[PDB]
Amino acid sequence: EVVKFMDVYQRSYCHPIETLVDIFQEYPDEIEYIFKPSCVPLMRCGGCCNDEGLECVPTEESNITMQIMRIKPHQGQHIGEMSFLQHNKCECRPK
Amino acid sequence: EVVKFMDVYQRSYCHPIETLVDIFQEYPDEIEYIFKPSCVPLMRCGGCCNDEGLECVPTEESNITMQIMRIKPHQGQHIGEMSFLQHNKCECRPK
């Protein structure tokens, strides 16, 4: 039950993958609040390139909207809509 | 469609997720070689917990074997098996 080479290469080469991302990364302006959940799942470019002088970066972006709980200290728990950026295609470019 | 609260939460709570991991970071000792591909897909703990004093951590691990191409500078390209650690179960625990 060893994973064969071309399978390994194909599954690791630069493409959009489901990545759990802290909401504060996307909304650093709203650092005073607490969010539930604190992490959200987003298609983002990752994996490797043929060379260690190339980076995996996106070429087509898009937005998705999710319901997130937001708590301000000495204030209420609100559930509300927040928008996040997703990556649809990726390319290997020089670093 | 707007993703519903309960669905966001279920998808992002502490669990094993396919993750692209740099082979250098798993074997810093073998820093002399070049790897192709240079990262691999592994089941690892990710996601968030109900609280900000808990970490997502593994409770059950195992090994998977993959065919990797190992290149030494001024030497040949050899494809051989390497072993990596996977997480099978995850739980939220204190830090």
Partner: peptide, 15 residues
């Protein structure tokens, strides 16, 4: 075998 794109077995000949 262009370094910027994905794959053919006969790229991996050359190694």
């Amino acid at each position: 075998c262009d370094i910027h794109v994905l794959w053919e077995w006969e790229c991996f000949x050359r190694x």
